[PDB]
PDB file of C-alpha atoms and ligand atoms in Angstrom:
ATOM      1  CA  UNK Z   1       0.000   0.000   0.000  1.00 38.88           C
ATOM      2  CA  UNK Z   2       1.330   3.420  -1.097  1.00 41.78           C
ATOM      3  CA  UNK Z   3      -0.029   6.572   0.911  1.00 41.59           C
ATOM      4  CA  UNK Z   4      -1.811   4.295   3.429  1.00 42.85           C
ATOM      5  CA  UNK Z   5      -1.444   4.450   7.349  1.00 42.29           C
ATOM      6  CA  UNK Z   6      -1.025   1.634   9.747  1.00 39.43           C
ATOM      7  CA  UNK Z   7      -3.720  -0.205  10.369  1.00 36.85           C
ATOM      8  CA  UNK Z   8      -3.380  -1.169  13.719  1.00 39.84           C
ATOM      9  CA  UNK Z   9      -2.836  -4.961  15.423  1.00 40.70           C
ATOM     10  CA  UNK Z  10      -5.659  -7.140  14.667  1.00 42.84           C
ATOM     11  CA  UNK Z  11      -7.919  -4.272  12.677  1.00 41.85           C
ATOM     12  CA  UNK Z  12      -8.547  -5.680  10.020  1.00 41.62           C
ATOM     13  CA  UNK Z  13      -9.610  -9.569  11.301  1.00 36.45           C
ATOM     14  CA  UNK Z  14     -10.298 -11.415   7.849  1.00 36.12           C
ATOM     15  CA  UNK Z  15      -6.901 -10.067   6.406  1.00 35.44           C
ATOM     16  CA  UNK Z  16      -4.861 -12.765   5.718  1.00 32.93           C
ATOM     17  CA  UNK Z  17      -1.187 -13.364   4.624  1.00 32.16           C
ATOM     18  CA  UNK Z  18      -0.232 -16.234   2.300  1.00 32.00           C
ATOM     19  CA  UNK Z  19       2.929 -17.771   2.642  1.00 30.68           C
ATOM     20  CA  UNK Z  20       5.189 -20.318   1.042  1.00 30.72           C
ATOM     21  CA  UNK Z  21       8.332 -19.416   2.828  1.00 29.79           C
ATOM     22  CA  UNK Z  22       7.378 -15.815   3.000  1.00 30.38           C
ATOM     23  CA  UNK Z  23       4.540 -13.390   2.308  1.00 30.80           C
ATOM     24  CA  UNK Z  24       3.792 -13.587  -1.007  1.00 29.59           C
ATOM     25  CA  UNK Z  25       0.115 -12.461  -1.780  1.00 24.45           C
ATOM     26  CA  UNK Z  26      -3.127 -11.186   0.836  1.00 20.47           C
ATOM     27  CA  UNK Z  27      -6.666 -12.748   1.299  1.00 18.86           C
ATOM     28  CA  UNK Z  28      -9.861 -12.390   2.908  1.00 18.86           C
ATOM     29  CA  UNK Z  29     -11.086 -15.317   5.176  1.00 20.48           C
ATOM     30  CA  UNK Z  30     -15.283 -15.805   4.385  1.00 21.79           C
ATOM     31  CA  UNK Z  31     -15.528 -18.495   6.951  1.00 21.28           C
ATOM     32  CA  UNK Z  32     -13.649 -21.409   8.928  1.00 21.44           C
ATOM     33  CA  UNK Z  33     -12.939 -23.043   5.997  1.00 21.12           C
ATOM     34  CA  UNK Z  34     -12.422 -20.784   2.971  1.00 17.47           C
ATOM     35  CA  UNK Z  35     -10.161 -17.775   1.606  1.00 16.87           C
ATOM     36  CA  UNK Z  36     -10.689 -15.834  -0.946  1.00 17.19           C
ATOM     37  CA  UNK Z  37      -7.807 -14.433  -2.977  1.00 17.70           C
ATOM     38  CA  UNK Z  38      -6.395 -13.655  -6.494  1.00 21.40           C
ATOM     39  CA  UNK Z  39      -5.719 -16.253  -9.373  1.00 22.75           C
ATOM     40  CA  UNK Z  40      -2.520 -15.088 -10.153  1.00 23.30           C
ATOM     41  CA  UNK Z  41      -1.791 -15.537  -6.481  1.00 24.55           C
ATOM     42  CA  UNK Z  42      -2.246 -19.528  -7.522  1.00 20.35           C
ATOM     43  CA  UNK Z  43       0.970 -21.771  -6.243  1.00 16.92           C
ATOM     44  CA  UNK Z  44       1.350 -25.011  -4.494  1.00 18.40           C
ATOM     45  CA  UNK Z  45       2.846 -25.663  -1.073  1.00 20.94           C
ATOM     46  CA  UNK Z  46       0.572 -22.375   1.348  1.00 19.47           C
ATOM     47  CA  UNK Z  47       0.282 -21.573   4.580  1.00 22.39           C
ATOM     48  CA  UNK Z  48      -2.414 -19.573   5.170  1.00 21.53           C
ATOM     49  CA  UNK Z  49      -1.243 -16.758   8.148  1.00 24.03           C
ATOM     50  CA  UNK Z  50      -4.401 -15.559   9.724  1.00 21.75           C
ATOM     51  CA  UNK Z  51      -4.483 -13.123  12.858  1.00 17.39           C
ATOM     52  CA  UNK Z  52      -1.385 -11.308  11.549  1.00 16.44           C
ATOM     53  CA  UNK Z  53       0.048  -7.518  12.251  1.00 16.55           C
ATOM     54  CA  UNK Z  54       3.627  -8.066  12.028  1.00 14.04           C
ATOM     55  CA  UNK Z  55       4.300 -10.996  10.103  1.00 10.83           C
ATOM     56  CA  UNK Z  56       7.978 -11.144  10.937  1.00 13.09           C
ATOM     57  CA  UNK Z  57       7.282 -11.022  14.482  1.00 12.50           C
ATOM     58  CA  UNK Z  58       5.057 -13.768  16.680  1.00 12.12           C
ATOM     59  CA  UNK Z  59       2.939 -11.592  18.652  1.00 13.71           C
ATOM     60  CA  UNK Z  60       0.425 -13.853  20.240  1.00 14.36           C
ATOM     61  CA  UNK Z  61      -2.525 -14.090  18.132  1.00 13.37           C
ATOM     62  CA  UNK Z  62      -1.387 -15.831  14.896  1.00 13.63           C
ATOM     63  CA  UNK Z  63      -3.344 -19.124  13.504  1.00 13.94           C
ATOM     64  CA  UNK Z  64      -0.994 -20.971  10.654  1.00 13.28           C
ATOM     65  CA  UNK Z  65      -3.256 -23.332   8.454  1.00 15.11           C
ATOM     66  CA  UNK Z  66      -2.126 -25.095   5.123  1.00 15.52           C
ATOM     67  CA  UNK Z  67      -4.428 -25.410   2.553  1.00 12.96           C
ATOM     68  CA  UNK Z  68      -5.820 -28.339   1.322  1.00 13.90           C
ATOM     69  CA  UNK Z  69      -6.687 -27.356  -1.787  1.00 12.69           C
ATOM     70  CA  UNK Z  70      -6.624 -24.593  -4.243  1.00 14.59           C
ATOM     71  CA  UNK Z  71      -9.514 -23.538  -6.690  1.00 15.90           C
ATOM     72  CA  UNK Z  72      -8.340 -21.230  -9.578  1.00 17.57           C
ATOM     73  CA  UNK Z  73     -11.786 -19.804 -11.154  1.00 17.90           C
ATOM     74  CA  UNK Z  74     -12.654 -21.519 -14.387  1.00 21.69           C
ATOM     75  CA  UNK Z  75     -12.565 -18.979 -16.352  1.00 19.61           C
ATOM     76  CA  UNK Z  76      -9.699 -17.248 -15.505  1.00 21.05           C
ATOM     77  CA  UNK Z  77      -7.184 -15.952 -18.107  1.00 21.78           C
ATOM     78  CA  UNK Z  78      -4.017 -14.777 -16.876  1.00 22.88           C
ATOM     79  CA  UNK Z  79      -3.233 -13.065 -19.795  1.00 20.67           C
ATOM     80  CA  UNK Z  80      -6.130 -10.723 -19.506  1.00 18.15           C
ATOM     81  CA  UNK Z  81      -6.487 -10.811 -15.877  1.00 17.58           C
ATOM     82  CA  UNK Z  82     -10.115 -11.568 -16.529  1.00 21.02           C
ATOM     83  CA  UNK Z  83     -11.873 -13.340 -13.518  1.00 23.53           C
ATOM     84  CA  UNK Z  84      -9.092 -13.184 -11.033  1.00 22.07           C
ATOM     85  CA  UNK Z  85     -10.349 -14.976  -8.397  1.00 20.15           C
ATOM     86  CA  UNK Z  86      -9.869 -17.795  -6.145  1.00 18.22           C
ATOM     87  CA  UNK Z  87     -10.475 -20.205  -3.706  1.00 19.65           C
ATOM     88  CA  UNK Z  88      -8.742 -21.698  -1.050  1.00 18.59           C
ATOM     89  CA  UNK Z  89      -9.565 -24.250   1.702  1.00 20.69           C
ATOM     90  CA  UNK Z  90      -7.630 -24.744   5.059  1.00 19.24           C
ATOM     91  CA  UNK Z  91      -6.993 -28.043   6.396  1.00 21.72           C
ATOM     92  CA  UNK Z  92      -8.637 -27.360   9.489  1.00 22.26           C
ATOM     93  CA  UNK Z  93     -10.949 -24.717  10.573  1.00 22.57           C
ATOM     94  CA  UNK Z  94      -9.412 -21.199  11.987  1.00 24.55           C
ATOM     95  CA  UNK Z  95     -10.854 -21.002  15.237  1.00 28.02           C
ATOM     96  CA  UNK Z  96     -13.006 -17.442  14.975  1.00 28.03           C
ATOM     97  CA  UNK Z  97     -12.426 -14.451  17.577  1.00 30.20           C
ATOM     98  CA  UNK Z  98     -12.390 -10.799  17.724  1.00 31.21           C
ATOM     99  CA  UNK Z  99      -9.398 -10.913  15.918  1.00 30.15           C
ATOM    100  CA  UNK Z 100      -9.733 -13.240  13.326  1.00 29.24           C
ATOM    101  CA  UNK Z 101     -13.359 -13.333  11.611  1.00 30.11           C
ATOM    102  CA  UNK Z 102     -15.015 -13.431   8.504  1.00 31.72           C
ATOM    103  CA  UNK Z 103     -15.837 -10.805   6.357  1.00 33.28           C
ATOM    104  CA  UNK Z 104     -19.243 -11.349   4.237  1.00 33.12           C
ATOM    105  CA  UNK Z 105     -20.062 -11.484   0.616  1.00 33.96           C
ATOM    106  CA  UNK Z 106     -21.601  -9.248  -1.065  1.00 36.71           C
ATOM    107  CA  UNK Z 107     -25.739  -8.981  -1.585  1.00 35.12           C
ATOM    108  CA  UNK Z 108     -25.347  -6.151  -4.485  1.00 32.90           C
ATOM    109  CA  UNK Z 109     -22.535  -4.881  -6.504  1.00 29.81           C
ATOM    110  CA  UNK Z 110     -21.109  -1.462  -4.844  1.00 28.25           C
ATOM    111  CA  UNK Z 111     -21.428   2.057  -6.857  1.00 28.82           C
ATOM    112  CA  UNK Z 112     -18.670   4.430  -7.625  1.00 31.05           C
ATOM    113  CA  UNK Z 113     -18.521   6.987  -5.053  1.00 32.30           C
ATOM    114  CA  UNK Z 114     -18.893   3.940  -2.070  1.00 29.56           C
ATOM    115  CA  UNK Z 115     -15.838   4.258   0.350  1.00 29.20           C
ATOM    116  CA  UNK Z 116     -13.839   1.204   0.985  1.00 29.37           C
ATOM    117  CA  UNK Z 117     -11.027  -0.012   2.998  1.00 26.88           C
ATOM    118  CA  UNK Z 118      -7.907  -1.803   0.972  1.00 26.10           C
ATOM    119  CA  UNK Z 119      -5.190  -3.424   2.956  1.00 25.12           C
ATOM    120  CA  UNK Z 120      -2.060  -6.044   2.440  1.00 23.15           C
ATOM    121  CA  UNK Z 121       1.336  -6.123   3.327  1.00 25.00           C
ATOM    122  CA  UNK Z 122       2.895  -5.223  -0.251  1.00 22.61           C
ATOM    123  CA  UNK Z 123       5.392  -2.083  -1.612  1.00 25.31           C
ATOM    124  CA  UNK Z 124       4.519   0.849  -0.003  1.00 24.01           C
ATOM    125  CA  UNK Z 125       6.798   2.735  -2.582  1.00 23.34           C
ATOM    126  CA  UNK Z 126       6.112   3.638  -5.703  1.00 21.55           C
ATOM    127  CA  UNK Z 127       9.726   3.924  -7.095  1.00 19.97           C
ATOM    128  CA  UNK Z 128      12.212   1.455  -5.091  1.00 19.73           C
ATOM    129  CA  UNK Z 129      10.743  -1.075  -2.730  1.00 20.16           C
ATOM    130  CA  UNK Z 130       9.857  -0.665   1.164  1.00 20.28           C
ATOM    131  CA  UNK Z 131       8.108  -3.757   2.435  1.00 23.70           C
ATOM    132  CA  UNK Z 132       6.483  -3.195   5.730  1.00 24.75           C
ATOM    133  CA  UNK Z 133       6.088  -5.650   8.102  1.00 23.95           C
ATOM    134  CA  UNK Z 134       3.020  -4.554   9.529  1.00 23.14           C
ATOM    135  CA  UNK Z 135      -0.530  -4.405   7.866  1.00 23.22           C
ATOM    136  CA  UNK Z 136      -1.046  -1.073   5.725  1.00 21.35           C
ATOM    137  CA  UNK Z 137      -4.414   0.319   5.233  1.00 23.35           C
ATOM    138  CA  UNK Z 138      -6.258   2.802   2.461  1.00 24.22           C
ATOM    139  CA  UNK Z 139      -9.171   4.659   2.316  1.00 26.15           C
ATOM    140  CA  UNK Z 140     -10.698   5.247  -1.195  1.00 24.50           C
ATOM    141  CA  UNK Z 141     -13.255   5.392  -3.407  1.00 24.03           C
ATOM    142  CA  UNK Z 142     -14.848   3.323  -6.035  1.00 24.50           C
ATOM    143  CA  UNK Z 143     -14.133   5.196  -9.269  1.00 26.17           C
ATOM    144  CA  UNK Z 144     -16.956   4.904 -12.159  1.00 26.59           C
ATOM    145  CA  UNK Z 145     -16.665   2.330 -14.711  1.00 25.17           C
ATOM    146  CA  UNK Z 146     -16.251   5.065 -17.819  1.00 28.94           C
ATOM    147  CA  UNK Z 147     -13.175   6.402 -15.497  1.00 30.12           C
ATOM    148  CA  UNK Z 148     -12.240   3.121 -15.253  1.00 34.75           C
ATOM    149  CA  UNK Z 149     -12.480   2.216 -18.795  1.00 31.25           C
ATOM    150  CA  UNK Z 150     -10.492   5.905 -19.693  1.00 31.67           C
ATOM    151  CA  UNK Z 151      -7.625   5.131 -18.000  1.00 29.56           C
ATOM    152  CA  UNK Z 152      -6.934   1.562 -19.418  1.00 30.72           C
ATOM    153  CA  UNK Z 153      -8.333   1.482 -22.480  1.00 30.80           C
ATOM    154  CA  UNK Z 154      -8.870  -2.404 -24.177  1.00 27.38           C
ATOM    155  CA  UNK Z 155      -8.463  -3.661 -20.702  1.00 25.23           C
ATOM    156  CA  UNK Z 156     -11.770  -3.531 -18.080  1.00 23.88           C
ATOM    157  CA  UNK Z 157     -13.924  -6.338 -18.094  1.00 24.62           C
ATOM    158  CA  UNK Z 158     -17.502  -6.177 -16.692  1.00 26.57           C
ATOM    159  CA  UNK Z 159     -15.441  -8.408 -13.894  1.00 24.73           C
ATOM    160  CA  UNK Z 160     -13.001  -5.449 -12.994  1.00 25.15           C
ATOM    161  CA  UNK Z 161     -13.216  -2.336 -11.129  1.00 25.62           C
ATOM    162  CA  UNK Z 162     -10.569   0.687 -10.523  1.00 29.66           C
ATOM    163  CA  UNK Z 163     -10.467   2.043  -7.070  1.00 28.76           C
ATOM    164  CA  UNK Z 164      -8.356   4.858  -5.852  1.00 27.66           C
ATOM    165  CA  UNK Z 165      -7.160   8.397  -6.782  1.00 27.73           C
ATOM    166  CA  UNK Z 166      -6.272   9.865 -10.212  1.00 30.82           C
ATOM    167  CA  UNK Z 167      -4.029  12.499  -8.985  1.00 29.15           C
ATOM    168  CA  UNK Z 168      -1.799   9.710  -7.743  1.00 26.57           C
ATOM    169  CA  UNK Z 169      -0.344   9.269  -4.604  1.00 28.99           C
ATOM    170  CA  UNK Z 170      -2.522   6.763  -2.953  1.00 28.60           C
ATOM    171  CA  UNK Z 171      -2.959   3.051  -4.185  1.00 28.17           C
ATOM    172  CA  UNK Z 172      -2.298  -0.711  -3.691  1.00 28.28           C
ATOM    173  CA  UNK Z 173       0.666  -2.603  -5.188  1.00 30.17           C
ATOM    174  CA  UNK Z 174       2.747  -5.559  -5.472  1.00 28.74           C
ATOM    175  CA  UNK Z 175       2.843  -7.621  -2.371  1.00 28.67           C
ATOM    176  CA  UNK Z 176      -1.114  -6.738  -1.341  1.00 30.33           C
ATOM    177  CA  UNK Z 177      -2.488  -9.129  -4.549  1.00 29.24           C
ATOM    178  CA  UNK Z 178      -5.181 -10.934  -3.325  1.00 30.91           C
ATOM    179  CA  UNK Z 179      -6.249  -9.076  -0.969  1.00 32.61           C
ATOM    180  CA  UNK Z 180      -9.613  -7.624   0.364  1.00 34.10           C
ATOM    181  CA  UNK Z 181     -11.136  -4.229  -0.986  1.00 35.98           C
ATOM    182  CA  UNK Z 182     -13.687  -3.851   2.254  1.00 36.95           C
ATOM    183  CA  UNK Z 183     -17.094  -1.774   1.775  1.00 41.20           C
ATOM    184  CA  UNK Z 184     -19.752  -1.180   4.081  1.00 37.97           C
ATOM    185  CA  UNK Z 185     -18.741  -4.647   5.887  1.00 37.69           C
ATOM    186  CA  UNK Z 186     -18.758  -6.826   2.681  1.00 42.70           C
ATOM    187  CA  UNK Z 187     -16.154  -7.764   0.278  1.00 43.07           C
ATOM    188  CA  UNK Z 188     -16.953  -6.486  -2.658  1.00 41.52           C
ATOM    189  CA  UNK Z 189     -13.028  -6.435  -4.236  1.00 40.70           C
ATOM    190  CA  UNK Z 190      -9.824  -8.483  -4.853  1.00 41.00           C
ATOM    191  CA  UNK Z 191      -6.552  -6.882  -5.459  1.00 43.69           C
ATOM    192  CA  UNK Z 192      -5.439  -7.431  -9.039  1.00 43.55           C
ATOM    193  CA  UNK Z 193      -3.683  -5.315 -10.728  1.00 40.31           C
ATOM    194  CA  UNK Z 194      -2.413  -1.715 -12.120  1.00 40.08           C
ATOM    195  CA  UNK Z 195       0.361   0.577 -14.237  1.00 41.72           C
ATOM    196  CA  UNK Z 196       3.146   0.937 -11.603  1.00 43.59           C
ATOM    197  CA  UNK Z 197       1.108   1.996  -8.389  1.00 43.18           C
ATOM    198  CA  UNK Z 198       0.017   5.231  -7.213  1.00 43.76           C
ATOM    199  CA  UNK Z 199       0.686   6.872 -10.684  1.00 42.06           C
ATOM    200  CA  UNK Z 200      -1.452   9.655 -12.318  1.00 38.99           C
ATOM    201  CA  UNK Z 201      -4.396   8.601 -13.946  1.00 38.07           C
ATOM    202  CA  UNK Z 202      -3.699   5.000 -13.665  1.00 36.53           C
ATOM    203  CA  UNK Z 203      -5.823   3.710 -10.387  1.00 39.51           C
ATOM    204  CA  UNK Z 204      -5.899   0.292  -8.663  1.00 37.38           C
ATOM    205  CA  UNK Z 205      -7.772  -2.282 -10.563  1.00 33.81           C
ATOM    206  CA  UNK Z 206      -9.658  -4.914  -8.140  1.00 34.93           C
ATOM    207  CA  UNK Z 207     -11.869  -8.310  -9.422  1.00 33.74           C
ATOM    208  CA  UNK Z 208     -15.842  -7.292  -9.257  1.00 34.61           C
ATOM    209  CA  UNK Z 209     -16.181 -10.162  -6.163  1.00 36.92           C
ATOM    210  CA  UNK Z 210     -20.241  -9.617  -6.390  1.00 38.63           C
ATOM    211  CA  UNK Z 211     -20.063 -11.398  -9.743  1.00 37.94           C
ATOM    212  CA  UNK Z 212     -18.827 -14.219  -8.356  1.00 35.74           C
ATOM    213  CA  UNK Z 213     -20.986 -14.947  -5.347  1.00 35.26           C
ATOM    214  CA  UNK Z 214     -23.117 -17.949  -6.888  1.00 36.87           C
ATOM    215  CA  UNK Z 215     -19.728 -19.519  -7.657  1.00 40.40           C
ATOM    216  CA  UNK Z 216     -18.090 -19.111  -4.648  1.00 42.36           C
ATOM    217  CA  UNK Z 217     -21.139 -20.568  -2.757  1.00 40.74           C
ATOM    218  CA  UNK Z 218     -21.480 -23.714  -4.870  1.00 35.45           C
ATOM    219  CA  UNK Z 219     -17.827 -24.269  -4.644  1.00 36.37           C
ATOM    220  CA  UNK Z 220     -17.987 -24.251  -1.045  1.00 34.94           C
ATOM    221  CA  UNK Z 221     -21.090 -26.107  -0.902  1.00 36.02           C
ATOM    222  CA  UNK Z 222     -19.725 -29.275  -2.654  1.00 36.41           C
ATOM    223  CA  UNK Z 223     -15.811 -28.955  -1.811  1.00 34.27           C
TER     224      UNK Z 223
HETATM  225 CA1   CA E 301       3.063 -12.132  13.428  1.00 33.89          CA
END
């Protein structure tokens, strides 16, 4: 996160890291069982870090589960981006507190204007690298879809949204993939992708998770 503040221990309780030796990509627990995250996050071999601030540090309230199994979406296309979404189930259920919970899905799409919350663990920089080892938070809006489409033309996808700031300064990047774009108390985004990060006129783009609701629901309902 670029232009974001600290989020505080424990804040943000369905944030989760996912690591394969390290942090490599954020998530968003939706119940005991399940994270959400991005496709292009996909690899064998994670641990799922839930209850995290400073994930270089054991500070008490930590809950390390590996996955059982990994479900990319079927449609994704990794050249395009398009439908970057998936699922992942722990082993064994987290055990839920104050400080590790779900977040919900979403009953409607959100509107442009809607405030949400972004967070992760990646770049805070946008030239050179600074990886913080505690969770970074943003504020920002949903931008409209012809903004959207007017900053990367050819590119958005009814699946796609851009969030953020066109002046700059202010945006997700590499590190916080996969992670949870919060609104009103429902998931309603997915860190994907973007030009460089916090760059003029080129905002955060995050998967549209309210198009995927009926799929994540029968793919936890039979897996
Ligand atoms: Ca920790």
């Amino acid at each position: 996160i670029v232009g974001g503040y600290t989020c505080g221990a424990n804040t943000v309780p369905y944030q989760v890291s996912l690591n394969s030796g390290y942090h490599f990509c954020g998530g968003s627990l939706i119940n005991s069982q399940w994270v959400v995250s991005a496709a292009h996050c996909y690899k064998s071999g994670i641990q799922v870090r839930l209850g995290e601030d400073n994930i270089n540090v054991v500070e008490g309230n930590e809950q390390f589960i590996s996955a059982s199994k990994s479900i990319v979406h079927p449609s994704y296309n990794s050249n395009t981006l398009n439908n970057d979404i998936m699922l992942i189930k722990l082993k064994s259920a987290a055990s839920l507190n104050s400080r590790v919970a779900s977040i919900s899905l979403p009953t409607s799409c959100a509107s442009a204007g809607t405030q949400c919350l972004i967070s992760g663990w990646g770049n805070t920089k946008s030239s050179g690298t600074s990886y913080p080892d505690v969770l970074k938070c943003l504020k920002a809006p949903i931008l409209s879809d012809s903004s959207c489409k007017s900053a990367y033309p050819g590119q958005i996808t009814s699946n796609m949204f851009c969030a953020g700031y066109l002046e700059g300064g202010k945006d997700s990047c590499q590190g916080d993939s996969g992670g949870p774009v919060v609104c009103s108390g429902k998931l309603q985004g997915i860190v994907s992708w973007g030009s460089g990060c916090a760059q003029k006129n080129k905002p955060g783009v995050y998967t549209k998770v309210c198009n995927y609701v009926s799929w994540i629901k029968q793919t936890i309902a039979s897996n």
